[PDB]
Amino acid sequence: SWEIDPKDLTFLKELGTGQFGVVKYGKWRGQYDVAIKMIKEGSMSEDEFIEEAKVMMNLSHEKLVQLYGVCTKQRPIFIITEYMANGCLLNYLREMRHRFQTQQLLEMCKDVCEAMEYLESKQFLHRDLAARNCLVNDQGVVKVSDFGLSRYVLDDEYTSSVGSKFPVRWSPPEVLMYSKFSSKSDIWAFGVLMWEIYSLGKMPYERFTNSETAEHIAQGLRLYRPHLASEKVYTIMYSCWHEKADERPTFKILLSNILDVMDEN
Numbered sequence: 001s002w003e004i005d006p007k008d009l010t011f012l013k014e015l016g017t018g019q020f021g022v023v024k025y026g027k028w029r030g031q032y033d034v035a036i037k038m039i040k041e042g043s044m045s046e047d048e049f050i051e052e053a054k055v056m057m058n059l060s061h062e063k064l065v066q067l068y069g070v071c072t073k074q075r076p077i078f079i080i081t082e083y084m085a086n087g088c089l090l091n092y093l094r095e096m097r098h099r100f101q102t103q104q105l106l107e108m109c110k111d112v113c114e115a116m117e118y119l120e121s122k123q124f125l126h127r128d129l130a131a132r133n134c135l136v137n138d139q140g141v142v143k144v145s146d147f148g149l150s151r152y153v154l155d156d157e158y159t160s161s162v163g164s165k166f167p168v169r170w171s172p173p174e175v176l177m178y179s180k181f182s183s184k185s186d187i188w189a190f191g192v193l194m195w196e197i198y199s200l201g202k203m204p205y206e207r208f209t210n211s212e213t214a215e216h217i218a219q220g221l222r223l224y225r226p227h228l229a230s231e232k233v234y235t236i237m238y239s240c241w242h243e244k245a246d247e248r249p250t251f252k253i254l255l256s257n258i259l260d261v262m263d264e265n
C-alpha cells in the first residue's frame, strides 16, 4: 500500500464530514488536487482496513474515484483520494435538475456502469452504491466513490439492517434477510441508482420508512418509471431488481444494454 508522506499534503478547504469524520480538499506536493479523509478515532476498523488496503489501492479505472494512498504512521490516519470538484452526484442532480438533457442522464449511468463492470471483473464489492456515493468532476464525469469501505464502518446504526443509517432503499431481499452481499446486490443498488439519476435525485420510496420499504419490496413492490426514463431505459434498471439474485444481469450485460440504447438514439 502506498504510504504517503503527510508533509507532502497541504490542506486547503473543508469538504464536510462523512462516516469517518472530517474530509478536506488539499494538494499533494503543491500540485495535485486530492481529498484527505481524517479518520476519526473509533469510527473505523483501522487494523482491519490497513491489513486489507492494498487491494483497494490497486483498483484503477477512469470511472473510480481513486484511492491514492494512506498515512498510517500517526494519529489519526489519513486516506488520500482523487478529488472531484462538483461533489456528490445526488446534490449535483438536484442543483442542475432543470438543465439536463436525457442523453446526459444515460451518460451518467454509463459512467457508473463502467466503474462497476471493472469492480465486478476484480471480484470487488462496493456494498454501498448510491447517488450519494458517486462524485462528479469539473467536466461532468461521474465516478464511483468509497467502494469497499462500508466493511470497515464501526457504527451499529449503519451496520445493522434495521439501523437508521443502513442503506435499506438500495438493498435486495437477500441482503435485508440474510446479509448476503454479492455482485448481485451491487446490481440491485445500481438499478436504484439509475432511478435516482432519471428522477433527478428524488429519494427512493419517499414517505415509506426503511422497514416499510423492506416489507413491501420483499412482497414485490418496485420503483415506478421516472418521467424522463424511456421504456428501454426503465427495462434496464428494472432488470436489476429480480427477486432472485441469480436472475439479475451482470454489469457487463448492463453496460452492453446501455451502449445499445445510446447507439439507437
Ligand SMILES: Cn1cc(-c2cccc(N3CCc4c(sc5c4CC(C)(C)C5)C3=O)c2CO)cc(Nc2ccncn2)c1=O
Pocket (backbone or CB within 6 Å): 015, 016, 017, 018, 019, 020, 023, 035, 037, 065, 081, 082, 083, 084, 085, 086, 087, 088, 128, 132, 133, 135, 145, 146, 149, 150, 153
Ligand atoms: C473525494 N471527495 C470526497 C468528498 C467527501 C466529503 C465529505 C464526506 C465524504 N464522505 C461521504 C460518503 C462516505 C464517506 S466515508 C464512507 C462514506 C460511505 C460509506 C458508509 C461506504 C463509508 C465520506 O468521506 C466525502 C466522500 O468521500 C467530497 C469531494 N468533493 C467535494 C467538492 C465540492 N464540495 C464538496 N465536496 C470529493 O472530491
